[PDB]
Symmetry: C2
Subunit: 253 residues, 2 copies
């Protein structure tokens, strides 16, 4: 296909096609929606991948070839009319992603992928970096399937998985996925009859002498104590970890 | 393409463009983006081979980034990214009844606001955390300084907002192998390949005990949070009593 080859230019070097990162959620679909009509909606974005539709609930999923194509489709189709309803197009939440931590600063995206590839087919692996491009010691591993993610999670929790020379065991947890795009809209927050009551008092600075001020100041102080205490735990445990290493070196000569 | 209630030409509409040829002109840079409507502020550093461009809406900037990134431009592949936001703040201790709109209306006190969002979980419930993006750095700084010094409240319930600079992290480019410094630490770290440590070895025994200490640390941190949640609760009733009249 001519069209397909033209759109294939949007795949990035080393990018795997039709991954979960290429998957779009489409909401507010008509009740009479067919799989062909849904695909016709995405016709301009090349050859479609797996399609899922929940006709009665008015939503579906579609995988496109590359992340770029899915970014274009989302931006072009979101909030467009479809028989009396504005479509809601979002990137689908990843179903098989894991958070990895305790990474050595010398673990790259490629080493992380190559390492986790033993648990099953891998879509992507990324080391989360800061503004200067330095490793945060945290990363994300996205698998093709949920069993492969469970295998990685179960084996890394049970066993000792090491990526570099330094014996730093990778700590593996399911990825906490949060929404900072739609968030908590007022039209939705309004539903609780209590939103009306809390909004009776407008945003403000509390004044010295009031209940609001004394309570809030003491709350901040408790919050500061909480951070100190958390930092102290961290320190105490850093010392315990060091004492462990020293004692381990002596015993294992 | 503009979304309902979306402000135009914000920092969320700003794109970074790297790997530009040395002989690039402001007009050629704009022509590169001509498809994406009327351009906003343009900045170019000709000698360093990069620029910034603001487009009308986030949708337009998303299309431009996706269409122009990794395309050839006289010997090099362009690198198109969303510009890091320079006036964004993390807000916490939010009441579960604070919406994106209330958060924006509240912070609009400190200066012009681009966007404010409450971060929700998979179940659409407030995490008690949010993001506020200002038009300018002085406004973000004002919001940051005032909310640290004073007690800023958004609802009837006296919950002070805690305001911090937004830690901005990269999970798109990450740490590529090609750009890792092959210094001595790298050299030492890369000698041993990825593996599972085996029972009886130093690596295993140490790593297992380290995991155990790490589990204890995590439990202890959770316990601090619980203890302080209890202190915060006793505080609420004490204050309600003290201020009864």
């Amino acid at each position: 296909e001519g069209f397909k080859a033209n759109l294939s230019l949007l795949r990035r070097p080393g990018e795997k096609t039709y991954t979960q990162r290429c998957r779009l959620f489409v909401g507010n679909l008509p009740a009479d929606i067919t799989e062909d009509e849904f695909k016709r909606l995405f016709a301009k974005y090349g050859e479609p991948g797996e399609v899922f539709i929940n006709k009665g609930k008015g939503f579906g999923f579609i995988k496109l070839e590359s992340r770029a194509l899915a970014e274009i489709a989302k931006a072009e189709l979101d909030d467009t009319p479809m028989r009396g309803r504005q479509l809601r197009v979002r990137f689908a939440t990843h179903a098989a992603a894991l958070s990895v931590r305790n990474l050595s600063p010398y673990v790259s995206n490629e080493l992380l992928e190559e390492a986790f590839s033993q648990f099953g087919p891998i879509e992507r692996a990324v080391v989360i970096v800061d503004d200067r491009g330095r490793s945060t010691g945290k990363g994300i591993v996205e698998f093709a399937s949920k069993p492969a993610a469970r295998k990685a999670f179960e084996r890394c929790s049970e066993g000792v998985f090491l990526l570099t020379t330094t014996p730093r065991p990778v700590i593996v947890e399911p990825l906490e996925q949060l929404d900072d795009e739609d968030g908590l809209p007022e039209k939705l927050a309004q539903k609780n009859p209590m939103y009306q009551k809390e909004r009776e008092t407008p945003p403000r600075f509390a004044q010295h002498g009031t209940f609001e001020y004394e309570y809030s100041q003491r709350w901040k102080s408790l919050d500061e104590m909480e951070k100190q205490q958390r930092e102290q735990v961290e320190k105490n445990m850093k010392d315990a970890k060091d004492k462990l290493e020293s004692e381990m070196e002596d015993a294992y000569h």
